[PDB]
Amino acid sequence: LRLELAVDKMVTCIAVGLPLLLISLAFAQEISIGTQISCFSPSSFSWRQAAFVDSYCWAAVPLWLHKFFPYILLLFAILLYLPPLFWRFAAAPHICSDLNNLIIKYISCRLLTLIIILLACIYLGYYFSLSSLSDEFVCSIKSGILRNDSTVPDQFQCKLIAVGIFQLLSVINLVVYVLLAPVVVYTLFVPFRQYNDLSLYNLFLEENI
Amino acid sequence: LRLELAVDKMVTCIAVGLPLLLISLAFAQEISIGTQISCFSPSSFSWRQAAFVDSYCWAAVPLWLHKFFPYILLLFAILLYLPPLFWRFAAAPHICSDLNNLIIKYISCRLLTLIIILLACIYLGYYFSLSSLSDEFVCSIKSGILRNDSTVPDQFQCKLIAVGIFQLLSVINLVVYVLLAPVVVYTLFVPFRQYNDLSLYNLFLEENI
Amino acid sequence: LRLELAVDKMVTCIAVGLPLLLISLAFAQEISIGTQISCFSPSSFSWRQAAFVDSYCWAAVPLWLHKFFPYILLLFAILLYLPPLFWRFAAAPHICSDLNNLIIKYISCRLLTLIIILLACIYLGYYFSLSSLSDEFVCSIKSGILRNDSTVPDQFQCKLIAVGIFQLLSVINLVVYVLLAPVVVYTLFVPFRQYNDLSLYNLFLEENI
Amino acid sequence: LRLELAVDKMVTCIAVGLPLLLISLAFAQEISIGTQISCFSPSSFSWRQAAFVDSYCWAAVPLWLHKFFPYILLLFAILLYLPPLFWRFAAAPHICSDLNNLIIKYISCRLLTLIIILLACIYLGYYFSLSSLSDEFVCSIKSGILRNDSTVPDQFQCKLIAVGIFQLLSVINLVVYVLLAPVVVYTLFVPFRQYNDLSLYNLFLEENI
Amino acid sequence: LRLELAVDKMVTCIAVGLPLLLISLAFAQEISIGTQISCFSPSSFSWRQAAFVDSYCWAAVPLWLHKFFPYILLLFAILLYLPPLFWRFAAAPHICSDLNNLIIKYISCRLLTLIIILLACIYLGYYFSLSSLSDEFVCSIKSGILRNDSTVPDQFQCKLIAVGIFQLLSVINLVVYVLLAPVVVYTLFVPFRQYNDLSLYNLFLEENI
Amino acid sequence: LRLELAVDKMVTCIAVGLPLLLISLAFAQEISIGTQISCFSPSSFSWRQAAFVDSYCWAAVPLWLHKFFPYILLLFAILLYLPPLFWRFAAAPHICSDLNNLIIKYISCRLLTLIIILLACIYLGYYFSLSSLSDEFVCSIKSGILRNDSTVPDQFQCKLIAVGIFQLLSVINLVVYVLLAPVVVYTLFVPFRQYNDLSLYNLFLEENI
Amino acid sequence: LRLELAVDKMVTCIAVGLPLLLISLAFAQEISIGTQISCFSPSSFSWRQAAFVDSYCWAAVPLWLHKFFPYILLLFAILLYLPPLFWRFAAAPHICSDLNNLIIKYISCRLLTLIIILLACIYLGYYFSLSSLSDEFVCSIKSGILRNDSTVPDQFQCKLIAVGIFQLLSVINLVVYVLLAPVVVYTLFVPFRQYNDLSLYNLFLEENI
């Protein structure tokens, strides 16, 4: 009682399990120290003031990708998990009853998977292409009531920490997602791997006998 | 043995699972540093005094939305989970026996779902519309016995930290909830998707055969 | 095999599940900073002395409600869970055998539920009515051997932190418990919702057939 | 297949479940700050020296009840759980076979339960009766090699913290245990609630039919 | 299908479950502060130096019993769990087949249990008998390269903390183990509680019928 | 119902379970202190500045192997788990039906396993061969706005901590993987351990009878 | 359906369960303070510098046994678990079919168990024999850029902490493993405890009937 094609199931399993694995690896205890951002406060600040400076410049951010990278990986995971979820609803009644129109549904689902994979490839290539030294910046807490007093200085050098691991994991993800696309575009050609529904039924009964 | 319509079940599953997912994402270890609020205490304060200042100005709050945002998302989740819970009690006896008045119950439940979705859309639009720089304020601990002594200063610049993630997640939630409403208003029109009970029974037996 | 009435079961489930949910929400990591009380110790005290001052003024307390609020909510939960627990023992033998005197037991249980709900309403109204600024006070550690030395000062401004969330959650609980009472007083009128036992048996067999 | 009397089972369940619940409530995160004892060390002591002073005066203790209160509640729980455990061994063979001497066993078990309940009442009354201000004392670390040096002072004011919650929970426990005793002494009178074994068999078969 | 005697099973269950319960109680969060040992370092030492002093004098230890008390309780638990474990191997074949020599095995197992109980009684009496003030000592870190420099002083007063709880729990354990021995020595007399195997078979079939 | 050869299954189980075990052992609480990297900051820096220096020089890195060693072990584990995963898909249909071409699949899978084992051997030999003193380096935070000020010095000696355990675990892994290769190359010779499919079927039915 | 001999199974269970139990006991919260190593840094070092000194001298190590003792115990556990694992593969086919050559396999497995037990005895005797005062040493951080500056001193006294517990647990393990060897060498003599396969089959059917 198998409702899917083994190659397509393996592709869906890999494409959605890789970014969650990279999010799990990027913040492991093994590879990473405790603080995400760090700003060099002067030597007249207490603990609480330097914590205020770090917490302010962390919330005062180009650099949007460096902060929200795990959320973007999770978004790619969800948007890539959606096409098989849409496929299950349209498929399981008709195949549960039997075992044209289903060719359109199957081709559109695999097409959406291919487009999401290509957009992930473009985004990860853009993320790796940018300068590694473009992870540090100059923050200024002087705002509001702190605009006139000369106790604090103007510029604060701030540096994100977990960005090099993000570069490396995006390289790994891009390397996987580049060679993942020939498999899905080979499964795109429905009548040759044995556009009518009869061919789809043939390739759905060859493994469910 | 299915007691519901697949499209309505999917809509209920998404509308109540999205805000809990956003609450889970907004306070993840990955995206967020440890302290919610931060106030710049002067450099003559110990740790405990600056902790007192932060704990006072956190409890001395417009800004009500910036503090109670997860509770409001949880309230929207609960108020949106209530209509299917009311539907189950009125439905499962009559449909469990069989498989006018039920049209009124079904239409009122979907109407309440639509109204809650629209109110969530209005609230999230209001929450995103306000100024991003309107997250910081000027707190004053001078009250009670601390009204006359000149050891502490008058104004304390305070800043909330997790507010930008709240803006972004409210944008995502609004984007989902805008396009969610055409689906529920399409399911609102009961006789065309095949106001008498016979049509409801037809669309409840087409998927439970 | 249902031993209860659906409306009464839902009422019992809500009335005992709401205060536990509010206790769970009031001390969540999301909404609340780490320390309950905070007292402004002078700038010549070490960490341990300020911790002693906070721990002394926390244990040197009108303000009784501000400290023991979760215990009072738990007490209302337990006292409201007791009437159905008493109902089960008197009911399940007679109804398990069959399916006057039971009218007295049922009416007394619902009456006790109504009285507990009304007392909860009165207490939460009293708790919300008091001044929000009446959460801070003036503590004095000068007692015992510390009565004569002039190293420590006399007055210490102390402030409770989690009190505004208590005001808001008591408002929510009062709003629910006000509109909960019409339902239980409607279920109080036993012969009209179809004082003899025959009517109770009719309304216990209409849903268990 | 019920081997007990419902009223006695409920009494045993309450009498042993209340003190464990009070021990669980007295040290909850909600109600209680982190440190049990606190001593005001002078302002020339480091962290480690004040920790040594607190750890010494915590282990240098009338006040025995204030330190070992949860252990005494656990002891009352165990000593009150012992009579039904003794009852099970003597009862389950004879009742498992059948369904004088058993009257003696049943009366002695309920008598021991009554005596333990009364001793708990006396102890909790004594614990509540003592002065609330009798929780703080004067400790002296000057002993051994620290008997002659004048770097440390003689007297240290020390204060226990979790004692007021102990007073309140002992009041609650006493209030429950006072009204618990009429129920057990009513179950003590074996022939009237329908000293021969025949009456015990009658009241053991009326609920196991 | 019971392979044991109820009284002996209860005795084995209590004698091995009490010391584990005391080890669990002696280091509970409720009763005990965080640090086991504490040494009064002078007021010119940083945190790390005082931590070095405490960690050195904790590892530079009469006092052997005060440090390894939970390990000795665990050793008594294991050595008292061994006789029933030896009994099971020799018993379960012969009794599983049937239901002289077995009298020797049973008497030797109960004898070893009695000897272990008596040795535990002697050790706990010795542990309680010693002076309560004999828990503090004078440690000297001056060794190795730290033998000539006069920056650190010679004597350091050190104090163990969890020793009074050890005295109290050893008193409780001794009180239980004294009155436990009449039961096991009553079970030692095999023919009277109804040395031949026939009597053992009689007292093994009276409860397994 | 066994779908594999016992020797090959044991080899796959060991080759993928050893590096995960070494990753688990290298960061155990037992063997390792809390901080991975450590840099000697001057004695005019606060806590937060030294934490900034450590967090900067940890993210400013030959030495790539010393930082990403657990990820490389995980990569070897995954790349060595892939050949049996590929074998299962091609094998389980044909063997599930039956019990040339399968010789090619089996030989290619075992060949890929051998190549991955050899590459792991070469990498671990290279990792052990390098100097143990080549774990410490000279970091410079002077960049950006911190290029001209003379408050901070130029050179910072930094040292990785968990590298010696990495040397030892790579030695252990190399010792295992050297003697693992004779077993897999003995299983490579398919017709002698009883290239046609008939011999493979003989050695797949000798253990599944 | 028992595939083993009870005495041999008990021996394997004890010999592999004892070192894991000792590793679990040596790092328990009860017996051990938080830091493994400790070095007396001078009183002009901040927290981070003393943490750097401790982390450097912990990674700059005769003394190899004092650092890697749990790994060596785990290695003895694994090397002692290997002979029964090898025995299962060679035994379970032939005994599962039936119930010379098996005498060789059984004798070689028990011989390897005896050799591993003897090597463990020799190693633990060597570990206990060495001086208890040989746990402290003199470390020098002066290397690299820190070779010429006179801000830090040359010698640092360092001390391992958990070594006395290692001595005691190795004594316990040696005491067990000495008296464990007569049992395994008694099971080594196969024909007397009833070298041909027939005797092995006799002693494998006497307990599996």
Q: Is G40 in contact with G136 (CB distance < 8 Å)?
A: no
Two structure tokens written together for D73:
């509640």
CB neighbourhood size of A33 (10 A): 17
> Cβ B159–A56 below 8 Å, yes or no?
yes
Q: Is D160 in contact with D136 (CB distance < 8 Å)?
A: yes
Two structure tokens written together for G182:
């007569």
* DSSP string for residues in E22-55: HHHHHT-TTT--S-SEEE---TT--HHHHHHHHH
> Which of G48, G97, G143 would you mutate first to test chain F, the one with the most F CBs within 10 A?
G48
Give Cα separations from B63 to A126, B66, C161, G162 (angstroms): 38, 5, 17, 53
Alpha-carbon distance C200 to C109, whole Å? 14
Residue with tokens 């929510």: C172
What angle, 0 to 180 degrees and rounded to 10, lies between the N-to-C axes of helices E102-129 and E163-188?
150
> Cβ D25–C54 below 8 Å, yes or no?
no
Counting as contact any 3 or more CB pairs under 8 A, the partners of D are: C, E
Alpha-carbon distance E104 to C157, whole Å? 77
* DSSP string for residues in C179-190: HHHHHHHHHH-T
CB neighbourhood size of A109 (10 A): 20
Alpha-carbon distance E170 to E73, whole Å? 10
Alpha-carbon distance C206 to C200, whole Å? 10
Alpha-carbon distance C8 to A162, whole Å? 55
Alpha-carbon distance F203 to C37, whole Å? 75
CB neighbourhood size of C55 (10 A): 22
The matching CATH number, chosen from 1.20.1440, 1.20.120, 3.40.50, 1.10.520, for D6-143+150-205 is 1.20.1440
Give the closest residue to C76 by CA, choosing from C174, C163, C6.
Answer: C174
Q: Is G144 in contact with F157 (CB distance < 8 Å)?
A: yes
Residues facing residue A158 across a β-bridge = A39, A137
Two structure tokens written together for B145:
């016995």
Two structure tokens written together for F106:
């089996």
> Which of E24, E39, E159, E171 would you mutate first to test chain D, the one with the most D CBs within 10 A?
E159
Give the closest residue to C38 by CA, choosing from D153, B60, E183.
Answer: B60
Alpha-carbon distance D204 to D208, whole Å? 7
Residue with tokens 């399981």: A92
Q: After which residues is chain C broken (C to N over 2.5 A)?
A: 61, 99, 194
Q: Is F55 in contact with A161 (CB distance < 8 Å)?
A: yes
Judging contacts by C-beta atoms under 8 Å, the chain A residues touching residue B157 are 144-146
Q: Is C174 in contact with C125 (CB distance < 8 Å)?
A: yes
Strand intervals (E) in C65-179 = 136-139, 156-160
> Cβ E70–G30 below 8 Å, yes or no?
yes
Give the closest residue to E66 by CA, choosing from E142, E117, E136.
Answer: E136
Report resolution in angstroms: 3.8
Q: Is F184 in contact with F11 (CB distance < 8 Å)?
A: yes
Instruction: Decide: helix, strand or coil at residue F39.
Output: strand
Give the closest residue to G124 by CA, choosing from G75, G95, G85, G167.
Answer: G167
What per-residue string of b and e applies to G83-106 under the rule 16 or more CB within 10 Å gives b?
bbeebeebbeeebeeeeeebbebb
Please state the φ and ψ torsions of residue A60, each to the nearest 5 degrees: -115, 40
Q: After which residues is chain E broken (C to N over 2.5 A)?
A: 61, 99, 194
Instruction: Decide: helix, strand or coil at residue B132.
Output: coil
Alpha-carbon distance G20 to G7, whole Å? 21
State how far residue A53 is from chain B, nearest Cα, in angstroms.
8
Q: Is G38 in contact with G55 (CB distance < 8 Å)?
A: no
Judging contacts by C-beta atoms under 8 Å, the chain E residues touching residue G155 are 145
* DSSP string for residues in G64-79: HHHHSHHHHHHHHHHH
Give Cα separations from A14 to A17, A109, A180, C184 (angstroms): 5, 17, 9, 55
Judging contacts by C-beta atoms under 8 Å, the chain A residues touching residue F94 are none
Q: What is the experimental method?
A: cryo-EM
CB neighbourhood size of F71 (10 A): 18
What is the enclosing helix (H) or strand (E) of F56? Answer: helix F47-58
Give Cα separations from D197 to D103, D107, D185, D209 (angstroms): 6, 12, 19, 18
Q: Residue F172: what residue type? A: I
Please state the φ and ψ torsions of residue A154, each to the nearest 5 degrees: -80, -60
Residues facing residue D38 across a β-bridge = D159
Two structure tokens written together for A173:
């993800």
> Cβ F159–G55 below 8 Å, yes or no?
yes
State how far residue D45 is from chain C, nearest Cα, in angstroms.
8
Q: Is G16 in contact with G80 (CB distance < 8 Å)?
A: yes
Nearest by CB to G48, from F41, F157, F161: name it: F41
Looking at chain D, list the stretches that DSSP marks H as alpha helix, in order from N- to C-terminal side: 6-26, 47-58, 64-67, 69-98, 102-129, 163-188, 197-205
Q: Residue B193: what residue type? A: R
Q: Is F40 in contact with G146 (CB distance < 8 Å)?
A: yes
Alpha-carbon distance D43 to B110, whole Å? 67
State how far residue G39 is from chain E, nearest Cα, in angstroms.
7
What is the enclosing helix (H) or strand (E) of G61? Answer: none
Judging contacts by C-beta atoms under 8 Å, the chain C residues touching residue D40 are 49, 52, 141, 146
State how far residue E102 is from chain D, nearest Cα, in angstroms.
27
CB neighbours of F202 closer than 8 A, spacing ≥ 6? F194
Indicate the fold that domain C6-205 takes in CATH.
de novo design (two linked rop proteins) (1.20.1440)
Note whether A touches B: 3 CB pairs or more under 8 A. yes
State how far residue G191 is from chain F, nearest Cα, in angstroms.
31
Q: Residue A59: what residue type? A: A
Q: In chain E, which residues touch D (CB < 8 A)?
A: 6, 10, 25, 29-31, 33, 35, 38-41, 43, 45, 47, 50-51, 54, 136, 138, 155, 157, 159, 161-164, 168
* Assigned CATH class of A6-141+151-205: mainly alpha
Closest alpha carbon within chain E to D54: E33
Instruction: Decide: helix, strand or coil at residue D39.
Output: strand
Closest alpha carbon within chain C to B142: C157
Q: In chain C, which residues touch D (CB < 8 A)?
A: 23, 27, 35-37, 44-49, 51-52, 54-56, 58-59, 67-68, 70-71, 74, 89, 93, 141, 143-146, 151
Q: Residue G116: what residue type? A: I
**Alpha carbon F55 to chain centroid distance?**
26
Closest alpha carbon within chain G to F208: G93
Q: Is A9 in contact with B10 (CB distance < 8 Å)?
A: no
